[PDB]
Design a protein around this ligand. Structure first.
Ligand SMILES: *[C@@H]1O[C@H](CO)[C@@H](O[C@@H]2O[C@H](CO)[C@@H](O[C@@H]3O[C@H](CO[C@H]4O[C@H](CO)[C@@H](O)[C@H](O)[C@@H]4O)[C@@H](O)[C@H](O[C@H]4O[C@H](CO)[C@@H](O)[C@H](O)[C@@H]4O)[C@@H]3O)[C@H](O)[C@H]2NC(C)=O)[C@H](O)[C@H]1NC(C)=O
Ligand SMILES: *[C@@H]1O[C@H](CO)[C@@H](O[C@@H]2O[C@H](CO)[C@@H](O[C@@H]3O[C@H](CO[C@H]4O[C@H](CO)[C@@H](O)[C@H](O)[C@@H]4O)[C@@H](O)[C@H](O[C@H]4O[C@H](CO)[C@@H](O)[C@H](O)[C@@H]4O)[C@@H]3O)[C@H](O)[C@H]2NC(C)=O)[C@H](O)[C@H]1NC(C)=O
Ligand SMILES: *[C@@H]1O[C@H](CO)[C@@H](O[C@@H]2O[C@H](CO)[C@@H](O)[C@H](O)[C@H]2NC(C)=O)[C@H](O)[C@H]1NC(C)=O
Ligand SMILES: *[C@@H]1O[C@H](CO)[C@@H](O[C@@H]2O[C@H](CO)[C@@H](O)[C@H](O)[C@H]2NC(C)=O)[C@H](O)[C@H]1NC(C)=O
Ligand SMILES: O=c1ccn([C@@H]2O[C@H](COP(=O)(O)OP(=O)(O)O)[C@@H](O)[C@H]2O)c(=O)[nH]1
Ligand SMILES: O=c1ccn([C@@H]2O[C@H](COP(=O)(O)OP(=O)(O)O)[C@@H](O)[C@H]2O)c(=O)[nH]1
Ligand SMILES: [Mn+2]
Ligand SMILES: [Mn+2]
Lengths: 710, 710
């Protein structure tokens, strides 16, 4: 039933509007937990704001809003109303009290603005503060500049400046994250045009430069004129492009907050933060009174040092005491934050929406999937029928309860997945004490040797099946034979066959009958990235990805499946490979030699969770899929990069199995290009493989091996 | 150099005291980052407060403070000054403005109380607000009742009520965590003597009356309610009555006060305390509330916090949580309750650790076990022993890693020399400027068994291990197992824990194995002594080995290499498992040959020294008591500890299994007693073991196996 309705205003004083929070100014009755999060976006061209808006801000905002999955044209169902009011073109023509009157005139303002968010995105000006003397009713405000008297914490949003309006950033112009230490340990550029700690900061930082214990470069005036700025701020110097050239050479970048403690955040402070994260300079913010973009959801200490101004006398020691792996961890998290929430208009709009939505406990929209066109066909000639894995069992838990990881760990909070490899496991007594649906413990829980083992999946999670995904192209005869080797496979739910050839399968084809369905899917084009699309016909969590020419025995498939049920976030597989350091060229090589150390497992024969299919196809960078289609190669390398980036673990190699020239050199090019897209090498090494527990173990007579051969 | 000094008051208005924050009212010059965190505690028996204090509060606080590592009697070096002012015996004699004057009279108040924390711990009263009319200068306040006017976020502290004053809580009266669902879905008991309260009552009654679930909601008390603040839902009965119903509740409702200015109250904090205490997952109606320690704890992992207007959806929401998610919230509530709420020591440690953390100073180093070496005389790769570097992450573990520090076990109170959770460098960093200590196989080209034996490789810099070997009255076998160690690569030293009460014989010739052999004396004979953090252990890696174990050198080297890639786990040879006793609904120790394992016995395993500190000094005493009673089960206890911390099974290396009846049955009793201590069974199952990557693989002639036999 519907949430209780907020009672509206029947004008309100500034004490009242400063007192607004969700618990007294937001109408939850428009927003049932199960009605989605429909968002109404006002067309700013119908209101006075449109013609005063900065043109690039307006254009990038309208294009993002048009493409957004939550936006609805039906104001009657909307939970949230968005009005874009800035930033405005300078000099600001419109007077404050006029800006107020047009806000109170918006079509769905009702009496007070409840459930509206006012968006005001900075791009060229660091001195605008359009809403300062404006009464906003019960609306929330999203902008980059706030004084204390205007910031309502937990209700307003501090957001990032819009830099890449009507453009795309170039991930190739970002310096690599390694080497850790750059030319300068830290730098700062600014100018101030006049408790005052500012004078001890300057004296301490100058003394560090003059000591010549580290290479630093600190400058408290600009070569030319400084950009205008708010009072007591350290104004920016030069153009975006000048400042970046220096920050690209800095291990750390100083950000000295404004001298007036009432300036909670400013356009200028957030710009410096934006620019430092953009190129991997770890921010060092002096002044704990600041509110950084998105601070209610992001743990900023993981990407930035935030330090009271009185500890300036200890900054030099502190920056010298951080290890290389801690410092590189901070750089790697600043890249995640900057890409996900700062870098484009889409990033920013998705962050505003997702912040408001999470604060009111509504799950994200469900990530799309690949609607498949089945190619119907005709077939030729344990004890139960296929069962799908349950879906969407954690809507509230992944949104609210897992708040920290949702927002501070990749891939971020914007999508709802049908399932994930990070679901917590039950303690091992719960299956015997009331939570046993689907559990199949070996030997009823007493365990045993090979007899009992083969009679039950066991493990720490309920039983399930897996889906085979088999890519094929112009190989109609070998396909039918390998499809037949799957007859009798335990726990097989269905086979999905991805038909890449442009010529459909001949009408007169007698596919085998293997006891489970065989769906043949049509592909709008011929790509190796098509094996990782999240086909709606895949109804399990587990995928066994296999080439139409791969020869796995049934016992291998079953041992791999049980390993993966205990390593659900990993690529678990058979073909082990590794990346080799090209010593003279200081670069990477693909290496498939026999080896005692591995770092990739090829997806021509491996288990992985369908979660990574959604990521590979819709969240990972386009430049990587672009390159897979160019070389018709390397999709297995890209998927080991993705999974090892998300998990920071190597893959897992199962059993002792191990199985032209311009193709092989395409794989050195791929490894080195993928490293430029990510900023670093995510692959890691393992010095073991997994076998069954009693592999090659001598046993008494009343005991049996788990498998005959593996 | 010292931090910049805060400029003192030369009386201040209420607008000034309400704006105090660390950035304008704390004097960082008393608190350099590297001078520790010395705390001065005023003796409240010298000031007016002492005779009015509740005597049990006063006695429990003074006891904790006398035993606290940070506390000093030298007020000249102190960074923080602590004064206990409450709670006071009822009816409260002392008038407000008097309490103000004794505060300004404190010996080291100086002019304004800077760097003072005022502590006011509740126990018996739910109506006290001692400091409401009291000017506090620049001092922080730590207490359980705050109105909005008085609460300074980020500066004041919301703490737990002091329930077990001068007592210890009994962990065996805590109902077990499983089964997940208990008799009632939720319960509530209280009486009350925008206004959403009427719809809440109506809604919750309708849920009771629907008989879709078993619930018990009562909006008056059997007898007279405890006194409370206005608009509060007052507590009913005595602590022992409320807990008997909560013990049977899956969820406990907490309905926050009707006046939104009452940010938190003793009565709300008591309901939170009692719910967590017995495993009822709190459901808090009202987001305006500030829960204890909320600046540091992510409460959404332990409680559902829900706007009052969404009461109409609470029933739907409680039914939609999966079993594994509800259990994870119960297990997190227990961690929070025990670490920060349960005793006077918990509370006082938490107040100190909050303020210390907020000013970026690391925790006191955990103690180690000063070894008394027993000098002895000895009989008759190319480098000399190197110890592991220590304390490389003081700032990062305190500030950067804030979330895990506070919200994951073991909590934030100790600084360890090193941990198994240090982040790993991306694999190109060893070649591009961070290569100190790294020994990659084939210099980064890799290879086969030849190169693999020449270099540890891996993802971490090289290091060594220490053998710890327990012995008791087996003088002849000891010398012989010590001699098996001669020649072992990467061995730093051998620490021999001499558990026999009779010293070694003076005429003893110990072997000379090429490294030192330290023989340490034990004050008593305990199996716990193999897990004490002897200050002679100079490495991170420990190879725990009984005096009668035969490990070959290759086994040790492959085990060491697995651990270097699995640093948080027990990595070892002897696999065992816990088996469910189907008729008695309880656990059994089982050592049969098995295809599924859950334990690795520490009689032959690698683990990180970090877990010796935890086993000895943090893990509950009752577990070490039982190990001493039966002289048994130290290996089951350490498997419980490590699987509790990591929620992962151990790792079993190679095919080795090979190595009276009242001993075997003591092990059933340990497993089932430990489950009572923890509240749940932490062990988990694995259906694989590890072997080298080319174990039993058919290799060309230009390639060599990693090891000859494993
Ligand atoms: C099994 O393991 C072996 C041993 O590690 C691998 O052998 C290496 O293969 C790589 C790539 O094929 C070789 O590296 C390349 O060398 C080129 C010049 O090599 C000559 O010189 C060596 C000895 O000095 C001869 O043995 C060889 O026959 C050649 O005559 C460079 O031009 C290459 O650089 C290219 O790519 C990089 C990107 O990283 C660019 O910077 C360059 O401009 C260029 O475009 C590269 O360095 C290496 O020499 C081989 N080692 C040995 C000892 O022979 C096998 O490839 C591996 N097998 C499999 C299947 O993976
Ligand atoms: C290798 O694997 C086997 C098979 O799982 C293990 O055998 C089991 O051993 C356990 C414990 O030793 C046995 O469990 C106990 O059973 C007692 C009654 O058993 C009788 O009945 C069976 C058949 O019904 C006979 O075969 C047996 O010889 C006996 O005559 C119970 O009384 C025990 O309960 C005790 O502990 C619990 C705590 O959980 C308390 O609550 C009780 O009060 C009581 O004090 C217990 O349930 C089990 O019967 C054995 N199974 C079989 C088939 O023999 C081996 O132990 C294992 N070996 C190794 C080395 O691990
Ligand atoms: C969890 O979220 C999913 C996705 O938003 C919900 O699934 C939708 O449920 C409605 C109502 O049954 C259906 O009409 C849609 O077809 C479903 N969408 C999809 C993509 O499956 C699900 O109901 C939510 N679960 C809970 C417990 O709230
Ligand atoms: C990290 O913390 C440790 C533990 O407090 C510091 O170690 C102490 O340092 C002082 C001065 O160097 C010595 O006199 C003590 O003996 C040390 N204690 C121990 C237990 O070794 C260490 O200096 C800190 N490191 C940094 C970089 O701040
Ligand atoms: O243009 C192409 C070429 C290949 N494939 C598929 O890609 C996989 C890998 O190709 P192949 O087995 O020929 O490589 P190999 O593993 O033999 O080196 C197989 O499933 C092919 O059917 C494809 O979909 N399109
Ligand atoms: O009172 C005792 C009994 C045993 N042990 C040690 O405990 C370990 C394991 O004991 P034992 O080998 O006797 O058990 P087993 O492994 O042979 O069953 C050995 O290192 C013993 O020296 C000990 O320190 N004190
Ligand atoms: Mn193939
Ligand atoms: Mn032994």
């Amino acid at each position: 039933s519907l949430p209780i309705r907020l009672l509206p205003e029947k004008l309100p004083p500034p004490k009242a509007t400063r007192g607004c929070r969700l618990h007294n100014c937001f109408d939850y009755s428009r927003c049932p937990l199960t009605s989605g999060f429909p968002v109404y976006v006002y067309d700013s061209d119908q209101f006075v704001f449109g013609s005063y808006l900065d043109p690039l801000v307006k254009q990038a905002f309208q294009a993002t809003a048009r493409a957004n999955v939550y936006v609805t044209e039906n104001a009657d169902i909307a939970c949230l109303y968005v009005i874009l009011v800035g930033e405005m073109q300078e000099p600001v023509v419109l007077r404050p009290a006029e800006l107020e009157k047009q806000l109170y005139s918006l079509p769905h303002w009702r009496t007070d603005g409840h459930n509206h968010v006012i968006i005001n995105l900075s791009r060229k000006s660091d001195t605008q503060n359009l809403l300062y003397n404006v009464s906003t009713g019960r609306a929330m405000v999203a902008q980059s500049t706030f004084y204390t008297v205007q910031y309502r914490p937990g209700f307003d949003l501090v957001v990032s400046p819009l830099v890449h309006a009507m453009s795309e950033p170039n991930f190739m112009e970002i310096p690599p994250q390694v080497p850790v230490k750059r030319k300068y340990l830290f730098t700062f550029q600014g100018e101030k045009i006049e408790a005052d700690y500012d004078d001890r900061i300057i004296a301490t930082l100058k003394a560090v430069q003059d000591s010549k214990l580290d290479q630093v470069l600190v400058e408290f005036t600009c070569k030319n004129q400084p950009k205008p700025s708010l009072p007591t701020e350290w104004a920016l110097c030069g153009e975006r492009e000048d400042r970046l050239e220096l920050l690209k050479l800095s291990t750390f970048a100083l950000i000295i907050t404004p001298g007036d403690p009432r300036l909670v955040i400013s356009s200028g402070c957030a710009t410096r933060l934006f620019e430092a994260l953009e190129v991997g300079a770890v921010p060092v913010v002096l002044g704990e009174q600041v509110q950084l973009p998105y601070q209610d959801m992001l743990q900023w200490n993981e990407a930035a040092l935030v330090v009271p101004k009185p500890r300036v006398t200890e900054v030099h020691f502190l920056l010298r005491s951080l290890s290389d792996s801690d410092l590189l961890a901070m750089r790697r998290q600043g890249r995640f934050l900057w890409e996900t929430y700062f870098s484009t208009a889409d990033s920013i709009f998705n962050t505003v929406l997702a912040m408001i939505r999470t604060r009111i406990q509504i799950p994200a929209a469900p990530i799309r999937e690949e609607a498949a066109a089945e190619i119907p066909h005709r077939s030729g000639k344990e004890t139960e029928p296929p069962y799908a894995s349950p879906r969407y069992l954690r809507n509230f838990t992944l949104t609210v309860t897992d708040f920290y990881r949702s927002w501070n760990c990749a891939p971020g909070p914007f999508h709802l997945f049908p399932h994930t490899p990070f679901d917590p496991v039950l303690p091992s007594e719960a299956k015997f004490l009331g939570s046993g649906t689907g559990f199949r413990p070996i030997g009823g829980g007493a365990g045993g040797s090979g007899k009992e083992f083969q009679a039950a999946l066991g493990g720490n999670v309920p039983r399930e099946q897996f889906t085979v995904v088999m890519l094929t192209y112009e190989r109609e005869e070998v396909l039918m034979n390998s499809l037949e080797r799957l007859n009798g496979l335990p726990y097989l739910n269905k086979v999905v066959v991805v038909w890449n050839s442009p010529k459909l399968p001949s009408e007169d084809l007698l596919w085998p009958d293997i006891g489970v369905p065989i769906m043949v899917v049509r592909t709008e084009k011929n790509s190796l990235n098509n094996r990782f699309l999240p086909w709606n016909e895949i109804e399990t969590e587990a995928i066994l990805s296999i080439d139409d020419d791969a020869h796995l025995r049934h016992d291998e498939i079953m041992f791999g499946f049980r390993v993966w049920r205990e390593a659900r976030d990993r690529i678990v597989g058979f073909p082990g490979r590794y990346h080799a350091w090209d010593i003279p060229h200081q670069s990477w090589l693909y290496n498939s030699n026999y080896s005692c150390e591995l770092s990739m497992v090829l997806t021509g024969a491996a288990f992985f969770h369908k979660y990574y299919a959604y990521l590979y196809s819709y969240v990972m960078p386009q430049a990587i899929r672009d390159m897979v289609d160019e070389y018709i190669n390397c999709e297995d390398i890209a998927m080991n990069f993705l999974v090892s980036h998300i998990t920071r673990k190597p893959p897992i190699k199962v059993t002792s199995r191990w199985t032209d020239d311009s193709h092989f050199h395409e794989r050195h090019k791929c490894i080195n290009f993928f490293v430029k897209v990510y900023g670093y090498m995510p692959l890691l090494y393992t010095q073991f493989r997994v076998d069954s527990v009693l592999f090659k173990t001598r046993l008494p007579h009343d005991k049996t091996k788990c498998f005959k051969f593996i």
